[PDB]
Curated annotation (Swiss-Prot), chains A, B:
Interacts with capsid protein VP0, and capsid protein VP3 to form heterotrimeric protomers. Five protomers subsequently associate to form pentamers which serve as building blocks for the capsid. Interacts with capsid protein VP2, capsid protein VP3 and capsid protein VP4 following cleavage of capsid protein VP0. Interacts with human PVR. This is Capsid protein VP1. It is found in: Virion; Host cytoplasm. It comes from the Viruses. Forms an icosahedral capsid of pseudo T=3 symmetry with capsid proteins VP2 and VP3. The capsid is 300 Angstroms in diameter, composed of 60 copies of each capsid protein and enclosing the viral positive strand RNA genome. Capsid protein VP1 mainly forms the vertices of the capsid. Capsid protein VP1 interacts with host cell receptor PVR to provide virion attachment to target host epithelial cells. It comes from Poliovirus type 1 (strain Mahoney).
Curated annotation (Swiss-Prot), chains C, D:
Interacts with capsid protein VP1 and capsid protein VP3 in the mature capsid. It comes from Poliovirus type 1 (strain Mahoney). This is Capsid protein VP2. Transmembrane segments: none annotated. It is found in: Virion; Host cytoplasm. Signal peptide: none annotated. Forms an icosahedral capsid of pseudo T=3 symmetry with capsid proteins VP1 and VP3. The capsid is 300 Angstroms in diameter, composed of 60 copies of each capsid protein and enclosing the viral positive strand RNA genome.
Amino acid sequence: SRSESSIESFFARGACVTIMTVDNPASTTNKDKLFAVWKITYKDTVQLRRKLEFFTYSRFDMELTFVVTANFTETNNGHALNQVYQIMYVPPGAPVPEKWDDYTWQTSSNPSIFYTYGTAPARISVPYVGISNAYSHFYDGFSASLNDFGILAVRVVNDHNPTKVTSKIRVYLKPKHIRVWCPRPPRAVAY
Amino acid sequence: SRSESSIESFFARGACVTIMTVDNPASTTNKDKLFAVWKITYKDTVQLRRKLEFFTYSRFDMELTFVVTANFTETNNGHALNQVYQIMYVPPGAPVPEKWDDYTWQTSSNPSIFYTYGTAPARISVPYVGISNAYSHFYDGFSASLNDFGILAVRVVNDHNPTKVTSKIRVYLKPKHIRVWCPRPPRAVAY
Amino acid sequence: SDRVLQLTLGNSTITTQEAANSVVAYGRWPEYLRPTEPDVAACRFYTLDTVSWTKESRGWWWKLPDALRDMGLFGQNMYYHYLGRSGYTVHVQCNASKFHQGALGVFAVPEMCLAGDSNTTTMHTSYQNANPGEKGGTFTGCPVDYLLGNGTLLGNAFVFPHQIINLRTNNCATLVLPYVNSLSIDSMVKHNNWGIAILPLAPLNFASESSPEIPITLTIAPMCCEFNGLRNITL
Amino acid sequence: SDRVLQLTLGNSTITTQEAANSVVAYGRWPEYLRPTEPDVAACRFYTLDTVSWTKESRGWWWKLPDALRDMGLFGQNMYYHYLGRSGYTVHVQCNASKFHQGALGVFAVPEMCLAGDSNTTTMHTSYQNANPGEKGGTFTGCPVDYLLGNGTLLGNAFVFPHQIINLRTNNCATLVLPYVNSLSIDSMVKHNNWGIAILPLAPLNFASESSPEIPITLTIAPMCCEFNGLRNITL
Amino acid sequence: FTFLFCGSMMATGKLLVSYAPPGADPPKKRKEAMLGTHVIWDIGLQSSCTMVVPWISNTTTEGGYISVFYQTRIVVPLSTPREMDILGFVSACNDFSVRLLRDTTH
């Protein structure tokens, strides 16, 4: 009897990949400026990374869940109306945004999702968007530059509010329908 | 193998067309007065415009999505109860409103949608409302005055509040079931 | 084992051990991509630099097709074709007596990378150092031997298909590796498919004084090779 | 003549005149010796140095296979095989208008020797001077033009198979020459089978001022080539 | 690739269209291009030349090259303008398609 043990249940978990931070300041703070940009990789985390690394090749439908919690940074009795956050999924190779202003931010192509705080977390799925037939966790030679599933972009959709509201985008990934080729001994230590 | 490449997926995108601004002032501000009026065209934007312009004739079911975010303009600790915004879709050739007061604003014909802030964005659809068999992106000669899909109208439904709440209507358009006749070389530069 | 037979791939002459157990990588045979197909011209035994297994040795390693870059016909197609794929019949023989004692470990690592926990940046090593040709490379006690040169505790190096040349048993290694990679065809020049490494499992010990060390041999034959687009015939 | 068709010997592209009369040497077709057979690799159109037919010209000449020594695949087999034989489809086109007047003479001399009544000693000329490659040689008014460069009154140069590129007729030359020699196979390096020479029968005269001269082109295809013994693959 | 010879009916010559697939560098001398896939195109026989390009792939870093060479040279009849032109027309093949939709507008 061998079930839960199978591939489709070795990765059938919702593990965090990244934690991105945004804000809605009325003041001029260009550092953590409104926008948040992060390169879609598994590389940042630990848990999910080692798991995949048991193999050399893969194919997986890539789903993502975005729970978003906020708060008021300054010790003030100030207020804020419920907010919205546009989550821009960017497919590999496109123009990467900076200033939350730019044309790219209107996309007309890139799938984006607007979410209103204080509800059931954000959710989408990107099927096997491999430029090859598989996602090579390792690649020996010269073109490291992995595969690239794209980049995630989130900003505060609502305008500048007298009371600065800081938020966080906890990103989780369930690699549904995963397939793997030729295993390696796993990484002994830490990264 | 040619799919995503086909017409039904060349335009199967939700691209912004316009960003309209409203307010709920207790003070007398007749400029950005309560009402917002905008001529339904693709002409304002860039991205969506060039796309269509690849062809000379078209038919498309015209859907629209209205995400609405707000805020308090004045640096005050003042408050506001959740609001509602009547979105008036106006079919081409009707009386265009001014003062948010007028008879037209009661319509009895024009489809309008009331929305309560802080939920799933506003959504409707207008099928091929062409006075011809197709929407000519270009038309050579004399009657420029395009085709006219009508005008969008939004106001704050709730009465005057001591604390002035400014909102924005981000309008997106997915031209579902689109059909095109005789292509032109696309516009080289900018508009 | 006696009754050993030679196979002549037109030009090449073998005279194996006999047969005494062979290894197929994940029970798969090299078959054609479903192009320039040289067949017999570039599907014939080529012998790499015979290396010296010494008491002190840490091991050896080669990349595919890298090693066979300077190999006549196969190497031509390789250099004259942008797109290309192939298979390999690895044959590592090591002959000693009944007065020598040791165990050889031949592994087949698809994409055999080496060192640097600087995942941030891999390859790093220079193009020349990453591609040491027919002459081959050696592990060091940087290809850290007991970490497969790649930070991974060697005791598991048995994940990849392999045979153990145990002196007191078979004096040969026979590994068949069909084409592995995400791509259907590949830049042979730039990308290395397989990694044939040969490390000592048991050390080399010889009775009294004899052969102060012994020799290991790698002759490999390309299996069903093909290529795309004949580029400029640069001579 | 219109309706001209291209033939693609894998790599090569032709687009002939159309067809307008071809010549078979002694009504014989190149057939296999009844070996290394490259086929399509070395049986594909190669273009020699296009030369300039000028009022003043005396003629031009090439040796087979000599000219095609520096020709990719065919030249490899040629240099890598001690014993070897072949055939050739000589195609000499010369395009002008209805404002040019002249007559070109293309001859196929099996063993086209040049000069020296010193029968006592032939060859004499140096190995390099006897083998001028793709670039070709020219007659002089020493290859004495009206003596076929070989002491024999040119008026008879019509013994060998030939076509006359008469400007006002066909703007092409199509000569097929099966393998001729006493031997069944030969030292391609050392021995030249055929001699394609092209001399003016009528001079070049052009109306008023136009093309101060015109161009002649030699693209030839080896016909059923084979070789014996693959020597050292010297790269 | 399709070429239109924009010279006189009276004018002639042979040109050479070449394509060295990826990896190979531009073939600097006639011979180098000629050695590979080449098309000898006679002017004095037709104005229309078409040479199809085989297998290629994108990520918008190096591909192939297409080149034109004076196989022979231009034959001018009598007193005709010694400098005429040519027109090139590229078009996709049946097998040509696309994937992953992006943009650019300002």
